[PDB]
Amino acid sequence: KIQYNLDTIDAEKNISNKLKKGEVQICKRFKNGSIREVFNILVEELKSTTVVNLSDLVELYSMLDDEESLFIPLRLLSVDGNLLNFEVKKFLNALVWRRIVLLNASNEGDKLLQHIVKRVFDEELPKNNDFPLPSVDLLCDKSLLTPEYISETYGRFPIDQNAIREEIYEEISQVETLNSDNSLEIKLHSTIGSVAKEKNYTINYETNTVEYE
């Protein structure tokens, strides 16, 4: 199944142009090690004549350090997520939100999270498809790192796949620490609740999903 479309080609073009202009940059967390080599390899796929598959494009966006760059992959997964199998979409959604949570944790006040959640509603993402919300269960699901997922996703890179697994494990562990005393569950609930309150959407607590009213 072809894993790109006009939408993802536009998104690739935009991030390639920003990277060439130095307008976006890798987040300090991914500057060294095997995870850096992933970044480096994806940046060369960007520059190559071959179109970047949505899964690779989402991963690259998710390693950047600005609010717009982290929102774009939520949009891509919401709008173009039919390019992916459900397991890859789930893993990627958790990957992106985990990286937003970890970056948000870098300043007091939760502005990055608030800005991203607001934009999800401002671009009416749930209007066009029911939008999965982040949850601490999703974010800390270490069981999503199956050896099949990792071999499939990273197998073709000249990188130790187990070192990739361990770095993602580290992210999961760090997120778990942020949820001491349920602090992250609360801040997720409150942010989303607050942005959504008077907007034309209901939160379907059954499926932790946002639906258009």
> Which strands make up the sheet holding 209-212, listed edge to edge?
131-132, 209-212, 201-204
SS3 per residue for the chain: CCCCCHHHHHHHHHHHHHHHCCCCCECHHHCCHHHHHHHHHHHHHHHCCCCCCHHHHHHHHCCECCHHHHHHHHHHHHHHHHHCCHHHHHHHHHHHHHHHHHHHCCCCCCHHHHHHHHHHHHCCHHHHCCEECCCHHHHCCHHHCCHHHHHHHHCCCCCCHHHHHHHHHHHHHHHHHHCHHHHHHHHHHHHHHHHHCCCCEEEECCCCEEEEC
Tell me the domain boundaries of the chain.
1-213
d(CA 6, CA 4): 7
d(CA 133, CA 8): 22
Nominal resolution (angstroms): 1.9
d(CA 153, CA 58): 12
PDB experimental method: X-ray
d(CA 26, CA 183): 27
Q: How far is CA 170 from CA 5, 142, 164, in A?
A: 33, 10, 10
